Amino acid sequence: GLPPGFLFGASTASYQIEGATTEDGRGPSIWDTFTAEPGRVVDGSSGAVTCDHYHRWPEDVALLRRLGVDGYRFSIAWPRIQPTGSGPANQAGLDFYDRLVDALLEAGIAPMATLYHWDLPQALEDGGGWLDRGTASRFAEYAAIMGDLLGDRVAHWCPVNEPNVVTLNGYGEGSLAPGKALEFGALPVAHHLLLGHGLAVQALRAAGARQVGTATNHAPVLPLSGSEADVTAASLFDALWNRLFADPVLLGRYPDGIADAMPGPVAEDLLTIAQPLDFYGLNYYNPQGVRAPFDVAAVPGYPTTDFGWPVAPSGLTDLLVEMTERYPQIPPILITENGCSYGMGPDADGVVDDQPRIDYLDSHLGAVADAVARGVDVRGYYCWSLLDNFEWADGFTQRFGLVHVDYDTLVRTPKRSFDWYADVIRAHR
């Protein structure tokens, strides 16, 4: 029950797939720094090699072509473009994405480029990172560079991936790079990510870009009990996770209380943040349980992925309906990420039977169709991920791919899910 012309895609991110961390003049990122620290990554791995997409991208483009996706979402590695985050572009970095995008177009695939998927150049973090308002300006300059190179050819742009994760996990509790734990002292990071977003939208449009949207994580937020402290906690988490990032982009305001806590000319900044968008991109995995200033835990009574995350497709329908209630002028929605961790690999016959991933993706596509049937204008779905890859602090232990990757041999093996998705896409055309 999906709309005619609904877009099917798959998604990746630069640090998670590329490898070649020290090749062609690439600068160190905060993830290079983080993964070099003992105890940061559960299996002691890094993105030094990962899938080695930097050398194997033709094979991967061919996989996308055989899958028959309409769209491919990828990220650009800012450290390949500006090793220190400022100054003239590195030509080898430009060349890599120039060639990749031309190949996607030859294959008939609509490229979706994420400018910032968490790999901040370390030189910028050394000066304060996203706590510095100047980092927003450096990001706008980088956006102009990539718009000048690719703006006529990229179909869709996502400036900042999951700014909520960058803020709360990167700078708030420090579970992800750069590992700062400022709690509410991380609020300026949210402001500067949003300002960076807005400035990048302007830079892309100026460069001749086609469609510009977002890729923000959203989730329904459920109180784990009836306690005021718990409903109040859940409301605050919803305000901080969802509204803090959606309200400024879509309504040109912060949730109640938050503007007063932000640095700089906040009213002027909100004009910059709230640039008109062509689409709203959202990343969904599951509802979030909250209690008791809050603690997050899994909502009970659902089956869980290998990451321990609830499998709750009805949550996507609920979110899509609620977003449309909160933001009646919201542009067409793309699901810029949805997917699941399940660890099966090739059996003795070389087959990866990942039926649980099929069940998850099938149910989520159904949930999208259920929202469409209630009048939610959703226009596409991008599966996280094409490839098994480096999952941040969990290293290689959480496999999200349609395609299995053996990290020793670098062989790709399409899973059963790959063939299932290919058939779904074909049937819908």
TrEMBL record:
Organism superkingdom: Bacteria
Keywords: Carbohydrate metabolism, Cellulose degradation, Glycosidase, Hydrolase, Polysaccharide degradation
Reactions performed catalytically: Hydrolysis of terminal, non-reducing beta-D-glucosyl residues with release of beta-D-glucose
Active site (record annotation): E162, E337
GO cellular component: cytosol
Enzyme Commission number, as recorded: 3.2.1.21
Organism of this sequence: Cellulomonas biazotea
One BP annotation, GO: cellulose catabolic process
Keyword Hydrolase tagged: yes
UniProt GO MF annotations: beta-glucosidase activity
PANTHER family tied to this protein: GLYCOSYL HYDROLASE, LP05116P
Listed name of the protein: Beta-glucosidase
Binding site for substrate: Q16, H117, N161, Y285, W384, E391, W392
InterPro entries reported in the protein's UniProt record: GH (IPR017853), GH_1_N_CS (IPR033132), Glyco_hydro_1 (IPR001360), Glyco_hydro_1_beta-glucosidase (IPR017736)
Keyword Hydrolase: yes
Entry's transmembrane regions: none
Protein family according to the UniProt entry: Belongs to the glycosyl hydrolase 1 family.
Gene3D superfamilies from the UniProt entry: Glycosidases
One Pfam family from the record: Glyco_hydro_1
